[PDB]
């Protein structure tokens, strides 16, 4: 009923496949535009499993740490946003990408950006 | 009354000296913790020159582009925050540092962080 389980695509070629559990869990995989095994990472997060019924979106967030069995970029991204249902459902998000740094390099530790995901590729 | 004109120091040792104009202008200089002429850059911004009288802070923001007559880091930082008056006045901020990039490197264009400024050095 949540509308969130399934495959989502951002506007630059990445794909994530998630299950929205009855308990508020988000679990799945995030795959970069490269599209290989090396390019797939574990995704884990949470969502509001009882959203408002007034037309408001469904709040959610998730994390990917950029380590898999093939590669490690010593970093993790969090996406914070909301699911917006209807004819062309969307997940609108802002993200923070933190890389592990020394204290001297902490100034350059955290990048910020945004993503919009749809159930259909760009 | 406004409380903003003067010298402010962040927790890293940087120093800014600002004038808060009657018209809402912020003008001054930002000097990194190194403290020399090559470390000083023009600061320009805006503030609420008629803040609420209910104990709220005074909203403000400013920009430094990291070019001076000595050096150019092809980047600019904005700080967004509010002035909080009282016994130990503070300016609490969040910042965005954007570097000029190619389109392919735009993913790493914008760093985010925070700064707390006080009238006394840390």
């Amino acid at each position: 009923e949540a509308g969130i389980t399934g495959t989502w695509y951002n506007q630059l070629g990445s794909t994530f496949i998630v299950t929205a559990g009855a308990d508020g869990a988000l679990t799945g995989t995030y795959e970069s535009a490269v599209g290989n095994a090396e390019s797939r990472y574990v995704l884990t997060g949470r969502y509001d499993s009882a959203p408002a019924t007034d037309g408001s979106g469904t709040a959610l967030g998730w994390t990917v740490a950029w380590k898999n069995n093939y590669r490690n970029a010593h970093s993790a991204t969090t996406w914070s946003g909301q699911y917006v249902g209807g004819a062309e459902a969307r997940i609108n998000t802002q993200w923070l990408l933190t890389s592990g740094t020394t204290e001297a390099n902490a100034w350059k530790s955290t990048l910020v950006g945004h993503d919009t995901f749809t159930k259909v590729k760009p | 009354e406004a409380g903003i004109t003067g010298t402010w120091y962040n927790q890293l040792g940087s120093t800014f000296i600002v004038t808060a104009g009657a018209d809402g202008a912020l003008t001054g200089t930002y000097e990194s913790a190194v403290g020399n002429a090559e470390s000083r850059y023009v600061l320009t911004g805006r503030y609420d020159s008629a803040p609420a009288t209910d104990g709220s802070g005074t909203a403000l923001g400013w920009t430094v582009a990291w070019k001076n007559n000595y050096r150019n880091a092809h980047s600019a930082t904005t700080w967004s925050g509010q002035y909080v008056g009282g016994a130990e006045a503070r300016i609490n901020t969040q910042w965005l540092l954007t570097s000029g990039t190619t389109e392919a490197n735009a993913w790493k264009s914008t760093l985010v962080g925070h700064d707390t400024f006080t009238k006394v050095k840390p």
């Binding site: 990445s14 970069s32 490269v34 599209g35 390019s39 590669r71 990408l97 | 490197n105 993913w107």
Partner: peptide, 11 residues
């Protein structure tokens, strides 16, 4: 120049 895996494109 290295592109982080979040943003990496096919060659």
């Amino acid at each position: 120049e290295w592109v982080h895996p979040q943003f990496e494109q096919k060659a």
